[PDB]
Symmetry: C3
Subunit: 415 residues, 3 copies
């Protein structure tokens, strides 16, 4: 049974933030959230978090998590509170990989104590590392400062043996395994916004590299952001300044245009998304054409072959096979069938000021331009709606439903 | 204090029709950066030496009380003699020199009567060499005229001097670096300082150097904001073209541009690709991606975007929600009101707790004049309504979808369009 | 007579693609397309392409190109690939040997290679690299090329050679017809090495000419997406640099993409994250705002394009004001002084001098005159479900807001259309057409709770 200890008490005053250090964002998630995620991935029997200043916010943020919280009112003094195997992690060192921490556990269980070390080209200011001791640069004599192997602070000690060493802090070899991380930023902490941004860029760069190793094409991998997870097929092409948030999926041959933003969205094979389209909680079928300037909101579901054009907003609406809304329109709380056409300026009036109501549009329907569909209304298959109509009664299958222009000659416009 | 700016260079490598000092850097001409800095220093007089294209330059800075002079670099300052306390000698094409550096130079120069800014560079090729015997500056030798031993000097001349107006009149009556030896000849000891940042004293000659100086400036500006506590998703994808005041816990996503004078309150979140110009945004507001603001005033805990367009006079109270493909121009929107869908609100006054449906349009323009639309509190404007200004929609009123409003709608009243549903059965489309 | 031979058979396994390697994209064009374009610039009499796996796609992609296709069913070396060209290889003249996955080689470089190889009968392109690890080494005896030794086989002394092989040769076809059948695979890999023709040429008493490219990425190949992205960035960086040398201003030249050609005037200003596709033109003093994307569009002098405007097949005159969030589609033609505002879509529409559409609108299949105004919410209803129809708007027409113009319809000069109108009949010159008021008022209405 492996338990993880997380130090998350730092105020991080260099952040100049009102929130505790470990709630600062990195790729769309608080620092501490990254570490809790890895600790849950390790199948940790227990997770104990040391909070400090502002711990109310932290406990509030992770309330639905089975964590044993501990107040801290030094790093050695901080761990001492946990006495009332184990990993020692830092809330502000967020990117340590589960494969590294397991690698540390296997070598520590055979010895009873392990740690992560790292070789740095420039070790100025860091603590210097059979391992014999660690001398911090502040108190380290000039001779030891030439060491380029530095300390990371990440330890793994047996639960039994920790209790013997922990109170006597006024040591381990007297009664030490080590590994180095696969990537240096795994063990990198942050103290201010400069360091937060530099780690963000290291993380994004590595994420783009891993996607390219999977076969993704990037117009510019330095202008890409993943804040979560994405599942990708083959021949996926991603243009500049795309952002991907939450958990997304991109099918085979999916092409994502410049500046598109996807959150909690799946896009099936063959779809081409033109530039500046944003998705949140959308499900997009195969061989669709979207954008530019399309906005899909939660509940937007597009069947295969659907076309969505510019300045289009789809919210909580399913659009059946091959239907098109090429021009500016608002489709909300709507069910639209197959092979239907939504004219420019069409609006679902889905909100009466208090409640939402459903619009139902059949197959092979033509909704003429500048139409207002007052929900709840059903428009049967094959029907046609005249341009500029306000529609309140259900339109029969195959029916044309439409809602007197006056002319004055030789009219002079105001001067 | 008077500032003398050398702004005669043609800058032919720019391959531009405008003189060099009108090329852009962070949203303002090169010379404008220097004039701005000269005004920060409280210069009694500002004298600018112009050359090719001086008509454009004088026209561009017409509302600035500067004494213009027509046109070697030493010969250039000599032409200013009819027009000159102390004076600073700056270059119009070296725009990013800071006022704190120029003040630092004045403190050491006032003690001697002549000081200068120098710089250490790894490669000093082509620059003038600062020759110091026992720590005191003796002369400046231009790279062309420098002995082989002297070419090893890595402290170079920047061309930025602070000289007494009295001593200048004796020295000026060809290269300006000869004023150094002239100074040691009269017994004065050339003071020196170095800038805190090398790009402060950097000139530009073509578009390559212009872009690299721009990127140096932007990197430094994002760094200073990060030191204040701003968060950047990517500090290399950020542009400041003016000034911005920030609160704590401000978060700025990628490719944000900030122009003019802006303000960002506490906990403000600016999404990807937003562009803000002369706009204030108060605490708690979240701006979604691709929203652009010009002359906007935004309250607390508002929700804006994505794809919002706010234009001058747009004023949003606290709790307002503005959604996608929305254009607000010269319009005030009261507390907690919503316009979540595509709409044009122009020249309008909107009350509190009101709802603007998709497709609503203020018809504010009759082809010649603009007219005001006035919307009260707790008004519901149904979708695709055309509001023909001037018109008032009183509190608690409701407007039916697809309505054209030309008469004032009474408080608590419903106005809706008589819409007869006409059906033709079994209709075949063409 | 000059012939170009393109080796385009690689599967490109590290691309993890379903497509052959040479159809992967670079600056908006498949790799092989860049080389076919340069080969046509050289005025090549013949173009012979060696395909392998997936040649059906390749043949389909360049079907409207006069290419002689040659299959390489088994992959047994580049020399074995060139051997395949013998049934269709000419007897006189010279041939260039290029790679489909080495796309950015410039025509000026290949001309220099042709000029020095005409003097000897065989030349090749070489390159000096700081680290030559993994490359084939150019072996010179008394300064004359004798062989290429692959990194696998090079002794420690030979690995110090920093002159590497690019694989790009210019050879007389007669000597190729003599050398290609006598190629030997009696080595370790069992492959027919193309470099053996260097050994055969020196054996015949020929001197091997050589040149170096002006830019190293000209001769760089790609095997995976990392290399693809790194070459793309190298190409874009170089493209922005050349535009700046011409006088273009960039807010950030590292946030710029040219995927085609662009002709530019003086004092052109290009903001961040602009993309340029196909063939474009920007006149003097044109300003392109942040994030704009232009494809096959010309923009004349003085026009100011605000941010997030997208153009495809547009023709834009002088001193127009466009965007932000403008969308121009093929056939969009704007006269001088036109203003296009936000959330505006123009498709196959001509707009005359000084006319304005400042607010959200769809103008499709329309002809619009001069000094006319399009109100917010205006729509040309151009599509009846089967055919498209034209909307005609005259000079100094005022189209009030939320108007639906049902094509085909004409709105005459000086006419005025009331807000919220549906127009189906032609509107006369100087005439007003408006919708009869139909607002019903009910006092003290309580909305649902």
């Amino acid at each position: 049974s492996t338990t993880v200890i997380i130090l998350a008490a730092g105020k991080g005053t260099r952040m100049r933030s009102q929130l505790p250090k470990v709630l600062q964002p990195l790729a769309g998630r608080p620092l501490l959230g990254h570490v809790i995620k890895t600790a849950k991935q390790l199948l940790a029997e227990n997770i104990i978090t040391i909070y400090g200043h502002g711990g109310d916010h932290v406990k509030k943020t992770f309330a639905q998590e089975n964590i044993q919280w501990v107040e801290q009112a030094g790093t050695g003094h901080a761990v001492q509170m946990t006495l009332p195997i184990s990993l020692i992690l830092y809330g502000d060192v967020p990117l340590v990989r589960q494969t590294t921490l397991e690698q540390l556990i296997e070598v520590s269980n055979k010895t009873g104590i392990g740690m992560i070390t790292l070789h740095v080209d420039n070790p100025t200011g860091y603590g210097r590392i059979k391992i014999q001791a660690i001398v911090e640069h502040k108190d380290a004599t000039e001779a030891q400062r030439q060491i380029q192997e530095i300390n990371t602070g990440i330890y793994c000690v047996s639960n039994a043996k920790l209790h013997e060493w922990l109170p006597k802090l006024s040591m381990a070899v007297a009664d030490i395994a080590s590994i180095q991380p696969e990537l240096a930023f795994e063990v990198e902490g942050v103290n201010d916004r400069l360091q937060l941004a530099a780690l963000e860029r290291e993380f994004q760069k590595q994420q783009a590299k891993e996607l390219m190793q999977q076969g993704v094409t990037f117009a510019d991998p330095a202008r890409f952001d993943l804040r979560g997870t994405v599942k990708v097929g083959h021949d996926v092409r991603i243009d500049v300044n795309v952002i991907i948030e939450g958990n997304c999926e991109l099918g085979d041959f999916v092409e994502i245009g410049a500046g598109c933003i996807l959150k909690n969205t799946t896009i099936a094979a063959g779809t081409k998304v033109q530039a500046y389209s944003v998705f949140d909680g959308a499900v997009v079928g195969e061989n669709t054409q979207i954008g530019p300037f399309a906005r899909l909101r939660p509940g937007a579901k597009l069947a295969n072959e659907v076309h969505i054009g510019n300045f289009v907003e789809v919210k909580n609406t399913t659009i059946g096979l091959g239907s098109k809304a090429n021009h500016f329109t608002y489709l909300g709380d709507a069910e639209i069938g197959a092979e239907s056409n939504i004219g420019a300026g069409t609006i679902t009036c889905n909100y009466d000021g208090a409640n939402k109501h459903k619009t139902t549009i059949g197959d092979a329907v033509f909704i003429g331009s500048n139409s207002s569909l007052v929900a709840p209304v059903t428009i049967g298959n094959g029907a046609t709606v005249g341009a500029g109509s306000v529609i309140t009664k259900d339109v029969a299958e195959q029916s044309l439903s439409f809602e007197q222009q006056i002319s004055k000659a030789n009219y002079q416009r105001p001067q």
